[PDB]
Amino acid sequence: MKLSDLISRWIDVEPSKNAQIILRDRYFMKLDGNYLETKWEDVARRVARVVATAELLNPSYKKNEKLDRIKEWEDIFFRVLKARLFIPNSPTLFNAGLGVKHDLLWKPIDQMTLEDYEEIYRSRNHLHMLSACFVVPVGDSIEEIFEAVKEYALITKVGGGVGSNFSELRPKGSFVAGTGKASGPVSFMHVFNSAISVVKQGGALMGILNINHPDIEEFIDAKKVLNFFNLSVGFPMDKKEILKLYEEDGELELSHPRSTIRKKVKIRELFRKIATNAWKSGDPGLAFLGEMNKYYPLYPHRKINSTNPCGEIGLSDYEACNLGSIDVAKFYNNGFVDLEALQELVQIAVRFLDNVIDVNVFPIDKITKAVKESRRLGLGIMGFADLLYKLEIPYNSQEARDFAANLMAFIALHAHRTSYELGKEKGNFPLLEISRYRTEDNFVPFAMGMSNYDDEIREVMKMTKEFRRNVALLTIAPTGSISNIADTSSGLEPNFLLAYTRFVTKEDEPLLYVNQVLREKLNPEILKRIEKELIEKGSLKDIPDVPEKIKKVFVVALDIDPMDHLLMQDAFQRYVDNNISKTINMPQSATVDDVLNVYLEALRTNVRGITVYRDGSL
């Protein structure tokens, strides 16, 4: 069906009362604390109008027509936004229009003149930061360490999540031209933690240390406060290499350019250390940085050393990335995903995300540059688990994973063809010429190998040798907050729970929530009886008197075994040029051996990183 007509079916559907609480708490703009916005329509309008003002910069538009052209983009943007088919990362919702006079952000589009958009463009203040994901380096000097703590605080203040690889820092007890002797990365990481603890935005930071750093063991056991850090162990070498060393029971030398300190450790003992900690507490994860550089169009002229906090974007030094997600559950139509409307939305969403770069303001000049030059986007999806329920497809099945790979491949195809086109109309990312899209033949920024679309995707990548707006376009984020605004499942995650009682504060209340798809499918009287047990058990699986087909379909996170989580992440990653946010849920009864087995399988699949969460551990 036409995107038009899907917009119609959603545009007058208001957010649930749950989404509305989140919105007034956090999203609706407010001196001294009065609401300038009271409906999601209000958010959609302000954001639509501000992202649309980037069309001022379009070299392919003549001065006459510019107002026409801009209003057209405002209205579609507004329509997909209000309908909740696509929502950008939170910072876009929070910060769009900051610094702009309130008479201009909600004004009827009727009364918008071309000098009103020009006024919007030039009044964006130092806080107009619309992107979620950042990486900064932490060089081996007191100067560079503390510039980086400053950078963390500046990024955080404006609503960014930031990560670093701390491996440049020489090991603890290393020689310093001082003085003393080097504190080592773990103890400097406390300064960064201490800083975010006082910069209150309203897991937060990613800190990575590489597997061959002499302080790695300390780093693995560091969270056992550091409470604001997610930690990952970095593998800048090739996955295959580490797999083989493991398989032969080999040893790894721990060493550092600027220390004499060296140790040999068995790779299995180190792995088991990691797995034991992650079994107990969820940290540290694994970051396969070598796998990310493998698919990075600019490597080695540039290099990915770290991810942002939730691990879904691998970023070079000072790079940033703005994200946004399509609710694929809204795309269900009579046993099929409606690809005609999904194609149009991918097109709109890539333009939306690329225009955000043009109206974004960063607090550090190096970040502004790093971004101008690459124009990395993070288009993803949410509502995927719910889409499966509608299609009657068990999440833990080869059917779901093949469908997942075809769906992502379709999106990757039309995302990169939109980038092709934007490069033609607006100009190429400055670094096209030195990227693998130019200097190579047959370069594809992801593994593929599970879809009919692979040839067409090869064709697209070849075409983008010539025209290409963006270094990379796709990610799957956690969507913790935008999936709640949109009333849908998060990211590619299964639903964690089908039913739970939530609580309204009123003024001076328990109100049962049931998954809406489940509500529409199960006999309402079967629902009434089983509800009690479903809430206590957290699952339908052991509930007598629930039909078997329902149940096979309506699995939640802990019904789905760890390998079936991991393989779903593999299926998506084959068609995503950045990385993926996936929690590998494990049952309380999983051992440290089971965790190691996940890591081992992880090395053989196409995943770019790993997070495990064992039920009841924390």
Ligand X SMILES: Nc1ccn([C@@H]2O[C@H](COP(=O)(O)OP(=O)(O)O)[C@@H](O)[C@H]2O)c(=O)n1
Just list the catalytic residues.
308, 310, 312
310 counts as binding ligand X under rule CB under 6 A: yes
State which of positions 172-191 bind ligand DTP (CB under 6 A): 176-180, 182-183
Binding mask 158-177 for ligand X (x = CB under 6 A): --xx----------------
Task: Check whether 483 is labelled as a binding-site residue.
Answer: no
CA distance 144 to 138: 6
140 binds, among a second copy, ligand DTP, Cl ion, none (CB under 5 to 8 A by kind): ligand DTP
Applying CB under 8 A, among 51, 96, 130, 195 the residue interacting with a second copy is: 195
CA distance 377 to 464: 16
169 binds, among a second copy, ligand DTP, Cl ion, none (CB under 5 to 8 A by kind): ligand DTP
495 counts as binding ligand X under rule CB under 6 A: no
User: 53 and 66 in contact (C-beta within 8 Å)?
Assistant: no
Task: Give the H or E element holding residue 307.
Answer: strand 304-307
588 counts as binding a second copy under rule CB under 8 A: no
CA distance 220 to 211: 10
Applying CB under 5 A, among 37, 40, 55, 90 the residue interacting with Cl ion is: 90
Which of residues 388 and 476 has its CB atom nearest to Cl ion in the complex? 476
Report whether the peptide linkage leading into residue 104 is cis, meaning its omega lies within 30 degrees of zero: no
Task: Check whether 222 is labelled as a binding-site residue.
Answer: no
Applying CB under 8 A, among 36, 109, 153, 514 the residue interacting with a second copy is: 153
Task: Check whether 199 is labelled as a binding-site residue.
Answer: yes
CA distance 370 to 409: 28
User: 133 and 161 in contact (C-beta within 8 Å)?
Assistant: yes
User: 601 and 284 in contact (C-beta within 8 Å)?
Assistant: no
Applying CB under 6 A, among 56, 129, 133, 169 the residue interacting with ligand DTP is: 169
Distant-in-sequence, close-in-space partners of 327: CB < 8 Å, separation ≥ 6: 84, 85, 86, 87, 381, 382, 383, 483, 486, 488
200 counts as binding a second copy under rule CB under 8 A: yes
Burial class (CB in 10 A: 0-12, 13-18, 19+), 77: buried
Helix residue ranges per DSSP H, 254-377:
267-281, 289-294, 339-359, 365-374
596 counts as binding a second copy under rule CB under 8 A: no
State which of positions 84-113 bind ligand X (CB under 6 A): 89-90
Which of residues 171 and 478 has its CB atom nearest to ligand X in the complex? 478
187 counts as binding a second copy under rule CB under 8 A: yes
* 512 three-state secondary structure: strand
Shortest reach from residue 483's CB to ligand DTP, in Å: 25
Strands (E), 398-519: 499-503, 510-514
Q: Which stretch binds ligand X (CB under 6 A): 167-175, 329-337, 478-486, 528-536?
A: 478-486
Pick from 278, 281, 273, 300: which is nearest to 289 by CA? 300
Burial class (CB in 10 A: 0-12, 13-18, 19+), 526: middle
* 33 three-state secondary structure: coil
39 counts as binding a second copy under rule CB under 8 A: no
Annotated binding-site ranges for cob(II)alamin: 282-283, 310, 585, 612
Q: Residues annotated as binding site for dATP?
A: 126, 140, 142, 157, 170, 177-179, 200
Sites of contact with ligand X (CB under 6 A): 89-90, 132-133, 160-161, 201, 203-204, 308-310, 312, 323, 477-482
Known binding residues for dTTP:
26, 90, 140, 142, 157, 170, 177-178, 183, 198-200, 312, 479-482
Binding site for ligand DTP (CB under 6 A): 140-143, 145, 157, 169-170, 176-180, 182-183, 199-200
